[PDB]
Design a protein around this nucleic acid. Structure first.
Ligand SMILES: [Mg+2]
Ligand SMILES: [Mg+2]
Ligand SMILES: [Mg+2]
Ligand SMILES: [Mg+2]
Ligand SMILES: [Mg+2]
Lengths: 183, 313, 71, 145, 103, 140, 211
RNA sequence: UUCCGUUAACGAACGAGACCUCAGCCUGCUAACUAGCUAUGCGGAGCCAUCCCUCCGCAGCUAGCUUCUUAGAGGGACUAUC
């Protein structure tokens, strides 16, 4: 327990349930434990190197949108910290487990290309989960008194439970449905 | 009468090029590598091999990182506190082993230095380089006579006898030359090799001189008479040659194995070979053989940077 | 794409053709002798010739090649 | 030959982009400062843990016998912190290599490497020059037809 | 000797300037004069960027011309006589030697 | 604890403590144009803090403590920032020189900062002592 | 009086570019190849490279002194602070400006272009260039303009070795029907002594010592 | 049109790449009063005095040195090893 996120949250007790989505969320291995969701890492030179990037950092990078927020990663890390504290307040559990549960219960597993229904790979699954989570939080925050950190916390908490009150889960459902209608 | 795998030490990440041993049986060794560094090994508490897959016959004690390119030959001082490391960057450095810093750089070689050798009394320094010249130095970094060969002088060993200080020289011109240090002239060109002479060695008594290289055949001549003698045949290209201090042996680091030959029966007494497990390191051979001062342990530097110790049992 | 051009490949086979004896299996030793039996106008081109020379010098040990290497 | 040398001084630098941080280490009582101020005050504050990582991992006990004075110039407010990080790590590694035995260096270097190679090896990434025909290195002016 | 001499050397080429500097510092070290140098100043990069087209048609393509000025400073302590006796060898074209006497 | 100089304390807390110190000392005379002026022309409102004069005095006192030779133009550049030009791109702008000069003269009329012959302003021994003895009171 | 080191090197460059222009226009029919400015401490010696080094000198050196005085007054040198010499271009065949002007006068006279361009090629190749190329563009025979290339030998076009191995010139002929263009590109051979051509061999050229 | 390989084609040449410049590495080299570092001395402040320690300023072409800065020379990668 030497490395803790923000020196306030433990990594050892994080259980990544899905065996499929296990090598594409970098939380369990000790090599993927970091103090800060900020690395300035070169996780884009190769095709499958962003999978070995810490998952909190992958969540943080999707907050640097839109263009008005591009490159502002310290503010994104601040949002992540203030979101992880609200998560611990409203769930009394480890915020990293809530985050991995939300990313697991948000990635669509089947999609319709071309309209044949195709199955999503684990990497695109986690990418879509993160994209939907941060997109829903950002759209909740836009033109709203609620802070982006509070909207992110609410979205993550509702996605961890599996409730259809989270924009990501509603959208996952639509996506997979259109791949059931067009099977 | 025989050697057993005492243990292995890993302190270099690339080909170990030379291993010098203290003359006074001090419990350390100095090893160079193509990682541009020297390494002093703590050999006070040697963990003998247990086949438990761990341990280290020795601990790396002090690193010496001053050279700019591959270190190729290091010889220790008679006192044991000083080391002289020739490097491919073209200079020689004199290191205080206690502190770990360079005490004198030896400039004057234009190409990669290949072999260094202290005199019997640590007064003169000789170096061999790719510039086809043999350079004599002082302990003050001043270049004396600059001895000739027609190729890379790969090795130059100081005859351990004092009636007439002599430096041998093996070259990529396929020759072995005996230079009289007193006049810095030449005495006898010992020829007969069919390939580059990548290694020479002189027996402690200062009579027999060994020579090997590309030909794969170790020709042992006599320095005093300059006449060829028995023509011991090794398996592959010989990288290093060394005489046992007290057991009348001649070990040759070849690309197949380490072969020790008793010069009395002219027969192969043993052939040590690494216990590597796969065809990964397709070529993993020994580059530098080194007998300890007592003559009880043989240190072998390999191409992976590991050092394997074989004690007499 | 790391495909060697003719100048690198041709020089490699001509160097092995003449100086097979004074050519080792190590890049760093081969790039030193390549400076003694040739005049190349670039370090980058000298490295590519010695790296492909070492490459060929190991395939010769395998046994089949389309050079000559009388031996 | 097999005795520890008298503890002395090392000077090591780290780099990120155009920021350079140089750490001067001397035998002391464990003081670590950057441009005179204590490191426990470095800013930005939410990147403070990034600069603390080498100390938090090597342990504050490995820094007792050294005083760390770090000068950092260039770059920005992130690259300077990432440079101070690498300067601290490389300074501790070099200090353990010249005055505290190679084995302890090897252990601390292995810890640093398993956490992050950036702690020891500088990232070689630099800004790409701008090309005419666009406002950026790759971006081109908007095309009409 | 007595006074302090600063020889400034400038050029557009590195090899000519460096070999002139080597000649100067070699002459200084033969006459047993202490020499501080050569000291290489930061290189000046004179840059001109202009539209290659002599008119306003085509892809607006830009050629970037550069002139690099290299400055070398040599600091001897001596008398003017030895200084002009040293800086009288064949100074190669393009090299601007300039001698200034300090206290 | 104590024995902490200025380069030991968090600047945000040191400036707040020293502004209170200056306001308590009662040796600062405020201009008539304290509630009117703006610190810069790119500013669109006067400072919202009533004690902004003492806060800026503490800020410049600390800056003169850490560096010697800052002039009025240097302090205009230090407290200058980004100007928004309406429909035009933003650029850097400088601060007001009257405010900097008046506060520095008020700080000369306390023996905190003097003026050096080499140009600008230096910190006096009394000013160094004052800032260092206030830095020890700052809670860590 | 104090001039920057920037302003000074730009001024030397502009002075060189202007001198060569006025010498090109003045010593046109003297075979002017180029000028080598050499600022010695006493005077700024100026060496002129030409083919008719008796036409630029003039009767008892009248023309050369006239040019020396014109340069002194126009460029504002100190009196006796400039001295214009006149040397011999060693190999006229290996100079693209000399051949460009020779082909200029070989066409101002009236000789057929297809016979003078091949003559220039001939002379260059006998001189020793590794390759030569001549381009003639303009209203050669008809009203529509066309470009006739005259290439023989080996000629590189790309990379850095071009600005070491390619000696090139561009000259106009002011004819009755309009302007005729002449591009002469002479490719030099690698000279170990660095007189006839470059001293650096071409980068791709590899030499293996015979065993 | 980069090679391999097939083959009435073989062997070349231009072009491509090579080349050149800038950037990335060098605790190796060369050298800095128009660049710094470190130490020393003095002075200022703190702590409370001094001392020590900490943060500063000034000085020393007899204080050393070149890590940081500069700029020359070189080295370094070759897909080298698996
Ligand atoms: Mg909002
Ligand atoms: Mg003004
Ligand atoms: Mg804007
Ligand atoms: Mg090209
Ligand atoms: Mg340096």
């Amino acid at each position: 327990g030497d490395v803790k996120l923000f020196n306030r949250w433990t990594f050892e007790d994080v259980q990544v349930s899905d065996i499929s989505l296990n090598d594409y969320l970098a939380v369990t291995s000790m090599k993927h434990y970091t103090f800060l969701p900020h690395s300035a890492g070169r996780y884009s030179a190769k095709r499958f190197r962003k999978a070995q990037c810490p998952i909190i950092e992958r969540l943080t990078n999707s907050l640097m949108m839109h263009g008005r927020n591009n490159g502002k990663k310290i503010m994104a890390v601040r949002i992540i910290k203030h979101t992880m504290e609200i998560i611990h307040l409203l769930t009394d559990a480890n915020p990293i487990q809530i985050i991995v549960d939300a990313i697991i219960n948000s990635g669509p597993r089947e999609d319709a290309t071309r309209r044949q229904a195709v199955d999503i790979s684990p990497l695109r699954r986690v990418n879509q989960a993160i994209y939907l989570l941060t997109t829903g939080a950002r759209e909740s925050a836009f033109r709203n008194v609620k802070t982006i950190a509070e909207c992110l916390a609410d979205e993550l908490i509702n996605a961890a439970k599996g409730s259809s009150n989270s924009y990501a889960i509603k959208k996952k459902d639509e996506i997979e449905r259109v791949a059931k209608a067009n099977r | 009468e025989s050697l057993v795998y005492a243990g292995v030490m890993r302190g270099h990440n690339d080909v170990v090029t030379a291993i010098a041993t203290p003359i006074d049986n001090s419990p350390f060794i100095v090893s160079s590598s193509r990682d541009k560094s020297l390494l002093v090994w703590d050999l006070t508490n040697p963990i003998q091999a247990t086949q438990d897959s761990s341990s280290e016959y020795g601990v790396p004690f002090r690193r010496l990182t001053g050279h700019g390119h591959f270190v190729q030959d290091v010889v220790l001082s008679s006192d044991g506190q000083f080391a002289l490391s020739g490097s491919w960057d073209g200079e020689l450095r004199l290191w205080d082993l206690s502190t770990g810093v360079t005490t004198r750089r030896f400039v004057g070689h234009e190409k990669d230095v290949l072999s260094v050798a202290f005199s019997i009394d640590n007064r003169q320094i000789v170096s061999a380089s790719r510039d086809r010249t043999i350079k004599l130095w002082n302990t003050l970094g001043e270049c004396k006579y600059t001895i000739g060969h027609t190729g890379w002088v790969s090795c130059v060993r100081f005859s351990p006898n004092n009636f007439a200080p002599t430096i041998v020289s093996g070259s990529w011109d396929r020759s072995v030359k005996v230079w009289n240090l007193t006049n810095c002239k030449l005495r006898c060109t010992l020829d007969g090799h069919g390939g580059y002479v990548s290694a020479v060695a002189v027996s402690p008594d200062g009579s027999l001189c060994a020579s090997g290289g590309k030909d794969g055949v170790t020709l042992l001549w006599d320095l005093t008479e300059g006449k060829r003698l028995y023509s011991l045949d090794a398996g592959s290209i010989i990288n290093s040659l060394c005489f046992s201090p007290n057991r009348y042996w001649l070990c040759a680091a070849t690309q197949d194995s380490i072969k020790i030959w008793d010069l009395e029966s002219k027969h192969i007494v043993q052939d040590l070979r690494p216990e590597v497990p796969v065809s990964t390191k397709q070529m993993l051979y020994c580059t530098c053989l080194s007998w300890s001062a007592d003559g009880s342990t043989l240190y072998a530097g390999y191409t992976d940077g590991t050092i394997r110790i074989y004690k007499i049992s | 794409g790391r495909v060697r051009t003719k100048t690198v490949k041709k020089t490699s086979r001509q160097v092995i053709e003449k100086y097979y004896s004074r050519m080792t299996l190590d890049f760093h030793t081969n790039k030193k002798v390549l400076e003694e039996v040739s005049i190349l106008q670039s370090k980058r081109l000298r490295n590519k010739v010695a790296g492909f020379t070492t490459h060929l010098m190991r395939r010769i040990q395998r046994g089949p090649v389309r050079g000559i290497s009388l031996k | 030959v097999l005795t520890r040398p008298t503890p002395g001084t090392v000077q090591c630098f780290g780099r990120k982009k155009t920021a350079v941080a140089v750490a001067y280490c001397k035998p002391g009582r464990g003081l670590i400062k950057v441009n005179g101020a204590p490191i426990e005050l470095i800013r930005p504050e939410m990147l403070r843990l990034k600069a603390f990582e080498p100390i938090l991992l090597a342990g504050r006990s490995r820094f007792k016998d050294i005083d760390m004075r770090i000068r950092v110039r260039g770059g920005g407010k992130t690259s300077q912190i990432y440079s101070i990080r690498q300067a601290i790590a490389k300074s501790l590694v070099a200090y353990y290599q010249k005055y505290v035995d190679e084995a302890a260096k090897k252990e601390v270097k292995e810890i640093f490497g398993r956490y992050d190679r950036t702690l020891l090896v500088a990232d070689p990434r630099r800004c790409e020059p701008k090309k005419f025909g666009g406002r950026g290195a790759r971006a081109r002016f908007q095309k009409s037809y | 000797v007595q006074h302090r001499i600063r020889i400034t050397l400038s050029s557009k080429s590195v090899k000519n300037l460096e070999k002139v500097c080597s000649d100067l510092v070699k002459g200084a070290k033969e006459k047993q004069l202490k020499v501080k140098g050569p000291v290489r100043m930061p290189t000046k990069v004179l840059n001109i960027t202009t539209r290659k087209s002599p008119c306003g048609e085509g892809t607006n393509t830009w050629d970037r011309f550069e002139m690099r000025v290299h400055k070398r400073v040599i600091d001897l302590v001596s008398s003017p006589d030895v200084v002009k006796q040293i800086t009288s060898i064949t100074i190669e074209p393009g090299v601007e030697v300039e001698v200034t006497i300090s206290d | 604890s104590t024995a902490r100089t200025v380069k030991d304390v968090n600047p945000h807390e040191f400036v707040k403590a020293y502004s209170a110190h200056l306001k308590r000392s009662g040796k600062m005379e405020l201009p008539e144009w304290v509630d009117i002026v703006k610190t810069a022309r790119f500013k669109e409102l006067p400072p919202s803090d009533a004690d902004w004069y003492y806060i800026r005095a503490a800020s410049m006192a600390r800056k003169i403590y850490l560096r010697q030779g800052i002039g009025i133009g240097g302090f205009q550049k230090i407290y200058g920032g980004r100007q928004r030009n309406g429909s035009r791109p933003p650029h850097f702008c400088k601060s007001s020189g009257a405010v900097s000069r008046n506060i520095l003269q008020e700080l000369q009329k306390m023996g905190i900062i003097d003026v050096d012959p080499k140009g600008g302003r230096l910190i006096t021994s009394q000013g160094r002592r004052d800032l260092d003895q206030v830095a020890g009171t700052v809670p860590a | 009086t104090q001039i920057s080191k920037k302003k000074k090197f730009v001024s030397d460059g502009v002075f060189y570019a202007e001198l060569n222009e006025m010498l090109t226009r003045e010593l046109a029919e003297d075979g002017y190849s180029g000028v080598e400015v050499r600022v010695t401490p006493m005077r700024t010696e100026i060496i002129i490279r030409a083919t008719r080094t008796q036409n630029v000198l003039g009767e008892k050196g009248r023309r050369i002194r006239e040019l020396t005085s014109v340069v002194q007054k126009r460029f504002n040198f100190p009196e006796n602070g400039v001295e214009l010499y006149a040397e011999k271009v060693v190999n006229r065949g290996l100079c693209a400006i000399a051949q460009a002007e020779s082909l200029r006068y070989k066409l101002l006279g009236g000789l057929a272009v297809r016979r003078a361009c091949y003559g220039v090629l001939r002379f260059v190749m006998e001189s020793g260039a590794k390759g030569c190329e001549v381009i003639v563009s303009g209203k050669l025979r008809a009203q529509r303009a066309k470009s006739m290339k005259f290439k023989d030998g080996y000629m590189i076009s790309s990379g850095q070795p071009v600005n070491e191995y390619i000696d090139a010139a561009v000259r106009h002929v002011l004819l009755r029907q309009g302007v005729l263009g002449i591009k002469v590109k002479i490719m030099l051979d690698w000279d170990p002594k660095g007189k006839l051509g470059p001293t650096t061999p071409l980068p791709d050229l590899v030499t293996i010592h015979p065993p």
